[PDB]
């Protein structure tokens, strides 16, 4: 049938949070408390659009 | 004999006419029922031959543990 559309490799380029699992776990509660608004916006976009290409930004 | 026991010819005439009308109506209804049954079996859009499908009231609509669904 159709042709599946994928974003280009430049659109997937971002600098990463290069920390291990225990570094994330130690500050997990404060990360949830302080950075809640963009995380919840991303999660709402994710559960609504059902498409990661619409939630890349 | 014709006064006591026998029936009038007019009575038999009109009785036969009533019987013929009823039986012709029945035969036409039987043929129409056959045609209706054939059409409903072929197309499946009528009230008969409605084989069941999955009821859609069983589908869960709440958000799941994974967004991609």
The residue with tokens 């599946």 is A4
What separation, in Å, do the N-terminal and C-terminal C-alpha atoms of chain B show? 93
Task: Answer whether B63's CB lies under 8 Å from A47's CB.
Answer: yes
Q: Which residue has the tokens 């009528």?
A: B46
Q: Is B67 exposed, middle or buried (0-12, 13-18, 19+ CB in 10 A)?
A: middle
Alpha carbon separation from B6 to A9, A30, B58 (Å, rounded): 107, 113, 73
CA gap A53, B49 in Å, rounded: 46
The residues, any chain, with a CB within 8 Å of residue A49's CB and separated by 6 or more, are A55
This entry's atomic model was obtained through cryo-EM
Q: Which candidate, A52, A17, A16, places its Cα nearest to that of A31?
A: A17
User: If you search the block for the tokens 């869960």, which residue do you land on?
Assistant: B60
Residue where the block lists tokens 């010819």: B9
Specified resolution (Å): 3.2
CB contact under 8 A, A50 and B63: no
Which of A42, A44, A47 has the most B C-beta neighbours within 10 Å, making it the best mutation to test the interface with B? A47
CB-defined contacts A:B, below 8 A: 8
Say if B67 is an interface residue toward chain A (CB within 8 Å). Answer: yes
């Amino acid at each position: 049938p159709g042709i599946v559309e994928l974003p280009s490799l430049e659109d997937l380029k971002v600098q990463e949070v290069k920390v291990s699992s225990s570094v994330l776990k130690a500050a997990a509660h404060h990360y949830g408390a302080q950075c809640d608004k963009p995380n919840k916006e991303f999660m709402l976009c994710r559960w609504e659009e059902k498409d990661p290409r619409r939630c890349l930004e | 004999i014709a006064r006591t026991f026998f029936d009038a010819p007019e009575k038999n005439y009109e009785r036969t006419m009533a019987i013929l009308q009823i039986e012709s109506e029945k035969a036409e209804l039987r043929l129409k029922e056959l045609e209706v049954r054939r059409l409903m079996r072929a197309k499946g859009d009528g009230p008969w031959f409605q084989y069941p499908t999955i009821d859609k009231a069983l589908i869960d609509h709440s958000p799941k543990a994974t967004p991609d669904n």
